[PDB]
Design a protein around this nucleic acid. Sequence first.
RNA 1: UUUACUUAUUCAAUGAAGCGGAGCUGGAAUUCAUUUUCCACGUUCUAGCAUUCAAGGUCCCAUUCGGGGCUGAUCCGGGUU
RNA 2: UCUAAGGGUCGGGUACGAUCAACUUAGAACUGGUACGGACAAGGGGAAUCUGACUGUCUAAUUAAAACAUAGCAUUGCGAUGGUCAGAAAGUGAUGUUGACGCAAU
RNA 3: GCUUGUGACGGCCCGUGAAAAUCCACAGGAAGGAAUAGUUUUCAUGCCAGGUCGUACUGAUAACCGCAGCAGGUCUCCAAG
RNA 4: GAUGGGGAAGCUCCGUUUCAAAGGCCUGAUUUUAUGCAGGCCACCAUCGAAAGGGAAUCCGGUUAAGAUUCCGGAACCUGG
Lengths: 135, 252, 77, 97, 52, 91
Amino acid sequence: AKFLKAGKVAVVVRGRYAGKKVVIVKPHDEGSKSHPFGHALVAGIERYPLKVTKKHGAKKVAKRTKIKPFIKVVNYNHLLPTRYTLDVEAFKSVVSTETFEQPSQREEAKKVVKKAFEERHQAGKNQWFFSKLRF
Amino acid sequence: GRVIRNQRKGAGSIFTSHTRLRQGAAKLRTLDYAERHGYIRGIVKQIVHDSGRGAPLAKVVFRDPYKYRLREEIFIANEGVHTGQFIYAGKKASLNVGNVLPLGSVPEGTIVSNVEEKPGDRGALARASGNYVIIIGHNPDENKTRVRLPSGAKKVISSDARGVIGVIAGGGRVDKPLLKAGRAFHKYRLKRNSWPKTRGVAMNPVDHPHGGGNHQHIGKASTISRGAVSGQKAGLIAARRTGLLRGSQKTQ
Amino acid sequence: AREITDIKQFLELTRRADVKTATVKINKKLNKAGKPFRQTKFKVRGSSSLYTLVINDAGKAKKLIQSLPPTLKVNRL
Amino acid sequence: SINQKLALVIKSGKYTLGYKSTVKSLRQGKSKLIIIAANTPVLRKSELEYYAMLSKTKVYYFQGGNNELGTAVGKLFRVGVVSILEAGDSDILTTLA
Amino acid sequence: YATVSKTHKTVSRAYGGSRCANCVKERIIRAFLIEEQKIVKKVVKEQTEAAK
Amino acid sequence: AKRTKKVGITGKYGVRYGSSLRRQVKKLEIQQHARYDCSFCGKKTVKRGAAGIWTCSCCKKTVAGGAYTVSTAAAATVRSTIRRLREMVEA
RNA sequence: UUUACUUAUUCAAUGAAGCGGAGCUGGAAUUCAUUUUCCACGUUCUAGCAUUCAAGGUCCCAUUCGGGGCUGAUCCGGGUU
RNA sequence: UCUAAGGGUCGGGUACGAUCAACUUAGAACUGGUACGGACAAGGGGAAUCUGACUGUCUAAUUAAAACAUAGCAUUGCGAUGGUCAGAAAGUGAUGUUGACGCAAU
RNA sequence: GCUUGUGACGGCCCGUGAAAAUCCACAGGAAGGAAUAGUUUUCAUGCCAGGUCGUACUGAUAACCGCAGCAGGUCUCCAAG
RNA sequence: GAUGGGGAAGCUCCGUUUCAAAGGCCUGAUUUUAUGCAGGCCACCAUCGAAAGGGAAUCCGGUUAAGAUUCCGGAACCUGG
Ligand SMILES: [Mg+2]
Ligand SMILES: [Mg+2]
Ligand SMILES: [Mg+2]
Ligand SMILES: [Mg+2]
Ligand SMILES: [Mg+2]
Ligand SMILES: [Mg+2]
Ligand SMILES: [Mg+2]
Ligand SMILES: [Mg+2]
Ligand SMILES: [Mg+2]
Ligand SMILES: [Mg+2]
Ligand SMILES: [Mg+2]
Ligand SMILES: [Mg+2]
Ligand SMILES: [Mg+2]
Ligand SMILES: [Mg+2]
Ligand SMILES: [Mg+2]
Ligand SMILES: [Mg+2]
Ligand SMILES: [Mg+2]
Ligand SMILES: [Mg+2]
Ligand SMILES: [Mg+2]
Ligand SMILES: [Mg+2]
Ligand SMILES: [Mg+2]
Ligand SMILES: [Mg+2]
Ligand SMILES: [Mg+2]
Ligand SMILES: [Mg+2]
Ligand SMILES: [Mg+2]
Ligand SMILES: [Mg+2]
Ligand SMILES: [Mg+2]
Ligand SMILES: [Mg+2]
Ligand SMILES: [Mg+2]
Ligand SMILES: [Mg+2]
Ligand SMILES: [Mg+2]
Ligand SMILES: [Mg+2]
Ligand SMILES: [Mg+2]
Ligand SMILES: [Mg+2]
Ligand SMILES: [Mg+2]
Ligand SMILES: [Mg+2]
Ligand SMILES: [Mg+2]
Ligand SMILES: [Mg+2]
Ligand SMILES: [Mg+2]
Ligand SMILES: [Mg+2]
Ligand SMILES: [Mg+2]
Ligand SMILES: [Mg+2]
Ligand SMILES: [Mg+2]
Ligand SMILES: [Mg+2]
Ligand SMILES: [Zn+2]
């Protein structure tokens, strides 16, 4: 299918976020007035949770498991579509075209996705995704 | 009577090798655990020209089974191997050009380079651009393997002597006339001070056994005895025949 | 070594602690095509470099001059 | 032959040539079959292979180099991958392939 | 290069001032794919070891 | 305009060394300067430089080969045998 | 005299790293009582990544943050090979 | 003293015009006490014999050659516990960062 | 135009044409670090100090070597019409 | 070319990381006190050898009988703290 649909996981392949894993939340298959290319709106993980261990106690665990997100308008030709896939519904809304334009709105979206992304990492749910891709 | 030229060479003065530019010494990986129980993968990272050498070298890097670090080797590149190729070295390793394998684990007729005489000597036979050795049989009890070296000599070594599948790159180098003195000059310029060569027969008697006389001539049989003595031995040493080899050579 | 144009920023150099001396230079120059105009360069000797500020406009300069810190040590011309 | 089929397509169907644009086609799921030349590197191959499974698209490993694949599709240049979007009369889509 | 600020010695993607970006693109795909295939390799020959 | 009747690239040497030596060099020179097909991307862009080192303009792969030609009869037929012998140890 | 031994003597290799012996498990094997045995006993589409006594499991310190044992990684001989 | 040919740079709805800057080369007149690469600069040529193929080398200070070297050709030794060579000796050295498409000796 | 610097190319090789100090970067993520206030000196500005020996002239038909103010020899850079 | 060594009657010869028990960095542990020990590494093996090779950083104007990228004037830059 047109597999770049509403839940597909992909890896960024070009530019800062290169190497980082994402989730498409809304695809603009063909075109923008701007973005003259097939492009996706992804929220993804910029600074992954650091591996946690038995030794890790109390507050360090809390510390180690902080996630740092990001949100990107990104050309299809810079995503490696994955076989995997993650539920988008809690930040369906918060990641929009209108989200971009104005920083404040962008900062908020990341707050939201962050709350989302961190909750999700606790209790397994969507593993792999919260694990760095080494290269 | 003067010390003659071939005695002078041994004290190594002007006669030592011209070594400054060489890539390093080519030699198989040390025969460790990996290589003799299983196998181990590398990448040929670069195949590169060693000065005063017939054949290309091949820089080939591996992991260090015991420490987190890269350790690289210098291989004489067998013809056909290439940058980026994977190389496997070990008892249980596959039989392709480039890989290195104990002469036991390859069937008769296999063709291998840089093969060691004793296992772990990091490789001694067949290293010149062009040369190789063919395995011509095994004797499983007391694990030997018999080969035929470049010379034509057969010789029978341990089954654990590592060889490397293939022949040595840069072959046929010697079909091209040197054409002028300069090329020979530049050839030797990067090996050692052994060119050009004055004939013993153009020297005075101080200089050589061939020295002097009113015409140029050797004056006595130039086939010299094995049990000659330094200063005598020049000509055809221990020569067991002499003259134009008429008739097909090739050992039986 | 440094040319400056923010007339704000400038003033903040002149009151910048490490700044003992200053020096004004005056220049007859020509404007655009025909006429002349009186250029003035405002040089502040800081510790690690000399900041200079050109006021092409005559008026803009005269006013700027009385502004100079009473406790600064201007070299006139 | 397989060439013969392919040549049928090329004279009556719809197709795109080359890596960048058969990926456009794979994304769109427009591709019915993609044809892969021998010498084409494994990264490229494995990458297509992946885009291929994702779009649920069968894959044929042309047992020939990119030079001839170009000949196959009747083009005076080389091609390292073909994508079928519309098979003309040819049965490549529903034969041995 | 030690008399000159950090930004002058890098670009902002992973392996900034070190590998050629078109070369990181490559790292990534390969990384991803070889790792994915590992799973297939694991689970294909896992199948064997119940049917052989 | 046909420039030499036969000495070809060997013209630089002019009259020296003798027809026969020139004849031999001409062969391997033509061999060694020539531009070859690349196994890997399939563009004829493999040129020599340094004996036995053949490397490729685009796609940058260096292949170890014969001293004046990319592949060598011997090395081919060895390739050939190693095939043969390998297969004996898969089935 | 032959041919066998290894500790003298001799030769090589290595930041003396995995040797020799036994056991586990797979499995060919054909069972003439039941095992007599023989091999195996974590890596091969790809110019990626492989490091912090390791994560896991389990046991302690007296729970704070830190940290230790054991296992993961089977035994026995200290003949580096 | 004339003639001809060989260039730049600008606007044109989606055929040209305007100028700026160059020594090259050929052609034609006129002219002189037939001179003019006017000083400077600047190969003598040809036909053979002997001999070394060529370029290169040497007797500093009586020999530059036909002598040495060279490519090419041919022979010899050697698979490392080795060939050839060094040292009084040695837990010593040259070839050797080497392996017969090699090193050594003619 | 001449000198010289440099670039993108191209020719050649059985010749493919040094080393080390030193400097930077990236992969890694040990660890440390905030709201009643933390982290930051690879951004700017500001403070201090920087020892030791050589430094004259000649470099040649007179400062060097040839017994000498010897027609010899003795490494280089700049270069007008 | 010193060094554990190995030769040599001996002056000395050989070996240069070599059949050697070949060493120092980061900071924690101190709040008896200054540095014992708590980690963890690195096994790198002397040294001399370039006033043309490598290499942190300066320019202009003025100035002397004779010094100047060294003085003075101005304006910088590097290294360490
Ligand atoms: Mg040497
Ligand atoms: Mg000589
Ligand atoms: Mg000869
Ligand atoms: Mg001779
Ligand atoms: Mg000779
Ligand atoms: Mg003579
Ligand atoms: Mg004599
Ligand atoms: Mg005699
Ligand atoms: Mg004689
Ligand atoms: Mg004679
Ligand atoms: Mg930058
Ligand atoms: Mg990072
Ligand atoms: Mg050992
Ligand atoms: Mg004209
Ligand atoms: Mg004009
Ligand atoms: Mg006419
Ligand atoms: Mg005569
Ligand atoms: Mg001559
Ligand atoms: Mg000449
Ligand atoms: Mg003379
Ligand atoms: Mg004399
Ligand atoms: Mg002469
Ligand atoms: Mg003379
Ligand atoms: Mg002849
Ligand atoms: Mg001894
Ligand atoms: Mg010059
Ligand atoms: Mg080059
Ligand atoms: Mg850098
Ligand atoms: Mg810790
Ligand atoms: Mg700073
Ligand atoms: Mg001076
Ligand atoms: Mg003088
Ligand atoms: Mg004198
Ligand atoms: Mg004189
Ligand atoms: Mg000594
Ligand atoms: Mg020194
Ligand atoms: Mg120096
Ligand atoms: Mg210097
Ligand atoms: Mg001055
Ligand atoms: Mg003075
Ligand atoms: Mg002076
Ligand atoms: Mg000063
Ligand atoms: Mg100052
Ligand atoms: Mg500082
Ligand atoms: Zn290629």
